[PDB]
């Protein structure tokens, strides 16, 4: 979903 | 000294904003690049965390909420700590390529939190800071802002932060110090909550303003500030 999310 | 030699070890090194100190200070060429250092020192914050002691104990959305919680008032803090090692709190170091004088801090129209955070680089040096101390300090501030709704795996997160802190009596070892330190640690969020109000409404008028946002960073300011600037996500303070 989210870009924080993906790049985590 | 295990806990030591870990934040010693992972420690990132200082990053630059690639800001041109050639051309002149106008608010718009200071802060495009304060939000491009920002994803650039956030991208450290998130490596340093991953290889923190414990940290991939918590569900992955805590993680990741606790970093974008408290990626600004963290950032502060080595800077608080940059400006003080270097520049003996003269000046503000966010980066070696953008260290900030009381000009840039009134043309950026951030001088108030400017100052403030000169204050907390100032209470560095007042209070014989150490850089343990400093790692540990800055440790503890990513376990520093919650829901109030707490998080998912709360559990975990109340332990974590509790032997963080038993950390940091020992690095003293006495409750004289503690108090003061404590007290900095509180006195980082009011100054994060003003920038996240800067931020916020930065980027509300950013189209109008001239000002770059990277990608990210506006997801963060648009999605995750809010939540600390409604009351929704609050700061755990050691005092009153
Ligand atoms: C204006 C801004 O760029 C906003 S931002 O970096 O996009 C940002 C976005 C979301 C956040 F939660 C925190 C910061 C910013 O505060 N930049 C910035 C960059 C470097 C440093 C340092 N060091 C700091 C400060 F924390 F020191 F103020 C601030």
């Given at each position: ?8 | ?14 990053v630059?904003?690639?800001?041109d100190?050639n051309?002149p200070?106008?608010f718009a060429?200071l ?6 250092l920002?994803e ?6 998130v490596?340093?965390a ?10 992955v959305?805590?993680?990741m ?7 600004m ?7 608080g700590?940059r400006?003080?090692t ?7 170091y966010?980066a070696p ?7 840039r801090?009134?043309?950026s ?8 955070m ?6 560095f040096?007042?209070?014989?800071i150490?850089?343990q101390?400093?790692?540990?300090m800055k ?12 998080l998912?795996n709360?559990?975990?997160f109340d332990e974590?932060?509790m ?8 690095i003293?070892?006495?409750?004289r110090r ?8 509180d ?6 909550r003003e920038?996240?109000?800067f ?6 008028k950013?189209?109008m303003?001239s000002?770059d ?9 648009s ?6 600037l409604?009351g ?9």
């Amino acid at each position: 979903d989210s870009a924080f999310s993906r790049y985590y | 000294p295990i806990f030591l030699n870990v934040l010693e070890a992972i420690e990132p090194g200082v990053v630059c904003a690639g800001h041109d100190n050639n051309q002149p200070d106008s608010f718009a060429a200071l802060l495009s690049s304060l939000n491009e250092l920002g994803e650039r020192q956030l991208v450290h914050v998130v490596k340093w965390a991953k290889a923190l002691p414990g940290f991939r104990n918590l569900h992955v959305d805590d993680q990741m909420a606790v970093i974008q919680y408290s990626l600004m008032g963290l950032m502060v803090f080595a800077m608080g700590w940059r400006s003080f090692t270097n520049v003996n709190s003269a000046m503000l170091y966010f980066a070696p390529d953008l260290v900030f004088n009381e000009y840039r801090m009134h043309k950026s129209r951030m001088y108030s939190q400017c100052v403030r955070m000169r204050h907390l680089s100032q209470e560095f040096g007042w209070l014989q800071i150490t850089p343990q101390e400093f790692l540990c300090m800055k440790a503890l501030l990513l376990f520093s802002i919650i829901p109030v709704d707490g998080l998912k795996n709360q559990k975990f997160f109340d332990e974590l932060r509790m032997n963080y802190i038993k950390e940091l009596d020992r690095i003293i070892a006495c409750s004289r110090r503690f108090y003061q330190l404590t007290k900095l640690l509180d006195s980082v969020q009011p100054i994060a909550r003003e920038l996240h109000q800067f931020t916020f409404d930065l980027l509300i008028k950013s189209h109008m303003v001239s000002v770059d946002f990277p990608e990210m960073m506006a997801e963060i300011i648009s999605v995750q500030v809010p939540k600390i600037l409604s009351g929704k996500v609050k700061p755990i303070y050691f005092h009153t």
